Amino acid sequence: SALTDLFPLPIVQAPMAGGVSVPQLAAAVCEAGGLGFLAAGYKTADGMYQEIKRLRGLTGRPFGVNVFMPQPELGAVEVYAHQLAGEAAWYETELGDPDGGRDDGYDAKLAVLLDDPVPVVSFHFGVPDREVIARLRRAGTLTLVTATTPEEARAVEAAGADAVIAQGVEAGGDQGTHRDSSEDDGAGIGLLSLLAQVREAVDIPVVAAGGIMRGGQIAAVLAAGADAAQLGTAFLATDESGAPGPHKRALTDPLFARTRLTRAFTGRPARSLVNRFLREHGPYAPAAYPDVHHLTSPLRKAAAKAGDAQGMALWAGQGHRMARELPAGRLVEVLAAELAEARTAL
Amino acid sequence: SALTDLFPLPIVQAPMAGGVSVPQLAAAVCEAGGLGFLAAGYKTADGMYQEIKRLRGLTGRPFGVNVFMPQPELGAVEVYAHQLAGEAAWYETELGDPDGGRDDGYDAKLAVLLDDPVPVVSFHFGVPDREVIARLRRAGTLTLVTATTPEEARAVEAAGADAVIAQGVEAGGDQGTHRDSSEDDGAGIGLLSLLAQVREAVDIPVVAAGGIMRGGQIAAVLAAGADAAQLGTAFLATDESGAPGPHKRALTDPLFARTRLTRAFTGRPARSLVNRFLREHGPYAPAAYPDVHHLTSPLRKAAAKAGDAQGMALWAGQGHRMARELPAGRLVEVLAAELAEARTAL
Ligand SMILES: Cc1cc2nc3c(=O)[nH]c(=O)nc-3n(C[C@H](O)[C@H](O)[C@H](O)COP(=O)(O)O)c2cc1C
Numbered sequence: 010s011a012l013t014d015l016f017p018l019p020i021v022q023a024p025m026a027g028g029v030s031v032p033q034l035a036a037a038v039c040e041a042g043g044l045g046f047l048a049a050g051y052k053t054a055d056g057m058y059q060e061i062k063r064l065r066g067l068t069g070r071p072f073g074v075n076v077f078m079p080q081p082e083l084g085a086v087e088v089y090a091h092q093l094a095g096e097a098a099w100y101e102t103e104l105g106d107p108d109g110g111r112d113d114g115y116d117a118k119l120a121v122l123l124d125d126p127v128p129v130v131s132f133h134f135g136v137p138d139r140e141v142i143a144r145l146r147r148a149g150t151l152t153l154v155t156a157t158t159p160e161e162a163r164a165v166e167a168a169g170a171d172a173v174i175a176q177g178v179e180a181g182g183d184q185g186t187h188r189d190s191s192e193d194d195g196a197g198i199g200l201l202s203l204l205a206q207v208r209e210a211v212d213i214p215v216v217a218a219g220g221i222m223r224g225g226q227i228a229a230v231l232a233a234g235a236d237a238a239q240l241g242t243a244f245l246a247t248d249e250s251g252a253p254g255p256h257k258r259a260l261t262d263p264l265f266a267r268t269r270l271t272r273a274f275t276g277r278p279a280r281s282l283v284n285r286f287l288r289e290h291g292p293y294a295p296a297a298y299p300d301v302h303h304l305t306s307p308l309r310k311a312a313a314k315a316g317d318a319q320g321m322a323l324w325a326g327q328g329h330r331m332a333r334e335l336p337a338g339r340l341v342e343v344l345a346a347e348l349a350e351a352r353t354a355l
Numbered sequence: 356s357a358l359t360d361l362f363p364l365p366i367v368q369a370p371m372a373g374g375v376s377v378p379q380l381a382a383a384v385c386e387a388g389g390l391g392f393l394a395a396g397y398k399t400a401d402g403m404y405q406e407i408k409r410l411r412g413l414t415g416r417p418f419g420v421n422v423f424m425p426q427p428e429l430g431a432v433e434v435y436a437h438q439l440a441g442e443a444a445w446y447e448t449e450l451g452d453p454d455g456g457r458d459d460g461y462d463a464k465l466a467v468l469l470d471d472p473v474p475v476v477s478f479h480f481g482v483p484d485r486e487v488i489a490r491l492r493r494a495g496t497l498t499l500v501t502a503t504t505p506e507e508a509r510a511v512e513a514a515g516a517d518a519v520i521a522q523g524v525e526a527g528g529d530q531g532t533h534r535d536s537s538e539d540d541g542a543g544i545g546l547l548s549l550l551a552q553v554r555e556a557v558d559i560p561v562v563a564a565g566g567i568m569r570g571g572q573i574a575a576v577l578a579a580g581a582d583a584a585q586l587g588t589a590f591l592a593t594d595e596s597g598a599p600g601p602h603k604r605a606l607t608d609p610l611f612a613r614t615r616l617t618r619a620f621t622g623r624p625a626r627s628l629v630n631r632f633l634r635e636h637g638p639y640a641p642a643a644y645p646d647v648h649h650l651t652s653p654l655r656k657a658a659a660k661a662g663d664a665q666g667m668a669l670w671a672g673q674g675h676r677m678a679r680e681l682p683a684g685r686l687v688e689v690l691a692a693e694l695a696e697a698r699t700a701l
């Protein structure tokens with residue numbers, strides 16, 4: 010597997026937007042034998058390029074860069090904005106523009122990734138045109154795409170990608186569904202089941218994602234057909250993580266004892282710890298991405314500035330309670346040991 | 356592990372009510388080295404006892420018997436019944452009595468299980484008084500209880516049970532939650548995550564349940580801390596299964612491409628293939644068990660009699676598409692081979 014041949018351990022640090030995946034995090038994972046990732050989501054092409062440059066200065070080992078697929082245009086947003094009037098007033102800020110870009114600098118970002126190739130590139134919220142994948146392949150870049158159902162996985166393979174990321178419902182953060190509709194609500198697939206379905210649906214390598222916090226779980230997905238495990242929440246609380254202090258603390262806080270998928274913050278299903286904002290607006294959030302994300306960004310930044318976890322997008326997978334606060338490099342070592350220990354037992 | 360010492364393969368055939376787990380099914384699983392189960396749910400104490408007697412005549416190997424915990428009493432039911440008036444008329448039958456028993460012959464069933472001990476007894480919909488568990492233990496019976504969260508698992512251990520069954524959201528049929536409330540809605544835990552949480556929460560053996568259809572998935576849960584895998588849907592479509600023909604056929608029917616948790620049929624969250632009945636009544640089903648189950652039984656029986664899968668409780672886990680129609684004994688062999696193959700690879 011070209012992917013696994015790139016790095017020693019079957020461990021991938023999930024790209025996490027919102028200032029989480031700073032170069033220092035990716036670098037530590039890379040130096041420990043795992044695959045570090047940079048998140049291009051919501052950044053400008055230049056912002057992404059600067060991180061890429063900095064990371065190369067921190068490590069010479071393979072790393073990945075994640076990009077968001079452009080979303081098509083399209084009452085609901087006007088109403089939700091109105092319902093947030095109180096949040097804007099309380100945080101003394103203005104809601105963001107729901108009609109901003111929807112491509113997230115896609116064209117410019119691909120230009121950078123093609124002109125100065127990186128080892129790995131993954132896509133979220135859909136599948137790239139097969140010409141984008143072919144061109145990146147020629148450049149020597151391995152391509153990955155997230156799928157949440159066996160059908161989406163088939164689409165990923167059909168596009169010619171090198172590997173598919175099977176993200177189960179337990180996953181923290183944004184669900185990588187290709188198309189969001191109120192019907193998918195309540196129909197999310199558990200990772201162990203999704204992995205098996207995807208493994209029999211496609212022939213390309215599968216990277217398992219969702220709720221993986223221990224080395225034993227990494228051994229579990231490998232046993233079920235995965236080539237590697239992608240972990241987000243586990244690295245979210247490491248020291249190199251750029252996630253706000255209130256967010257890191259919430260992960261193990263008994264007060265935030267539950268997570269759930271919501272469109273409250275971005276307008277697309279994403280798993281977050283249940284808090285005030287989710288409770289109040291979660292039931293009414295419309296399917297409109299990145300429209301809603303633009304709308305609530307000022308709110309989230311204001312909340313983070315104040316240290317108010319109740320107004321933040323507390324992204325977290327179902328294994329958040331097992332999050333460990335230590336250097337990412339040491340976390341990889343611990344994970345590797347747990348993995349070995351589980352293989353031996355099995 | 357006293358449990359695993361009982362039978363050679365880490366495979367448990369889940370007890371399945373509704374006439375699915377006939378003695379012939381349990382026997383075939385037992386003879387193949389797995390642990391067969393009889394379902395006492397909704398049967399009378401005598402009905403259960405007759406199956407127990409018959410199964411002993413079919414195999415001398417260890418088997419289990421599953422019993423439902425009595426439920427406490429408690430507008431919603433009156434309204435739901437009204438909404439089903441059309442179903443009753445169409446199927447030309449009368450709705451059942453929502454105020455029937457709620458103990459499901461618990462006292463009488465325990466009397467039988469204590470007077471003539473069986474190898475294993477599992478409980479669903481709660482945890483038995485620790486005196487019930489202690490008495491069964493003295494009789495030489497191993498006890499298991501289903502938990503859906505790490506907290507419920509702790510309760511299972513605290514009661515002194517020999518092992519806990521960690522049932523994830525992917526599971527087919529009835530969720531074994533100890534207490535049902537509209538809050539749990541949307542907060543189900545994926546098996547891979549639940550298993551890890553339960554393994555660190557308790558010290559007793561864990562049996563993993565939910566979406567397991569292949570031997571590789573059995574290797575997966577074992578690697579994550581489970582002592583065995585409990586499979587329902589995989590055995591539901593075997594020849595020895597007593598499930599109606601329309602139910603077995605629906606499992607691999609492209610028309611029924613999705614499952615979801617609903618209270619439509621029983622008044623408690625249970626995963627079923629999405630069909631007409633679920634679509635029409637699922638959004639309005641109240642939390643009232645076994646009240647709703649009593650209410651819809653006549654409807655379900657009428658639908659089954661007519662071969663109308665759209666009016667049946669098509670219980671099925673998320674791996675239903677991988678269901679194989681063959682003797683249960685051969686399914687165990689195939690599962691065992693897949694398991695070995697996965698261990699070797701890992
Ligand atoms: C903090 C937060 C931010 C995330 N941001 C991204 C992102 O920008 N792009 C992406 O492809 N996935 C993103 N993910 C999803 C991860 O790729 C992965 O699917 C998820 O973290 C797996 O669950 P645990 O978090 O490992 O349960 C994010 C997840 C969280 C935790």
Ligand SMILES: Cc1cc2nc3c(=O)[nH]c(=O)nc-3n(C[C@H](O)[C@H](O)[C@H](O)COP(=O)(O)O)c2cc1C
Pocket residue numbers: 369370371372373375394396421478479501522525526527528529531564565566567585586587588589591670671672673674
């Ligand atoms: C046909 C149907 C009926 C079931 N009946 C029972 C039951 O009476 N008692 C019980 O404890 N579990 C029952 N279960 C749940 C199983 O114990 C197990 O948790 C579930 O089948 C696991 O998922 P798959 O079905 O293995 O995904 C039933 C499941 C289905 C498939």
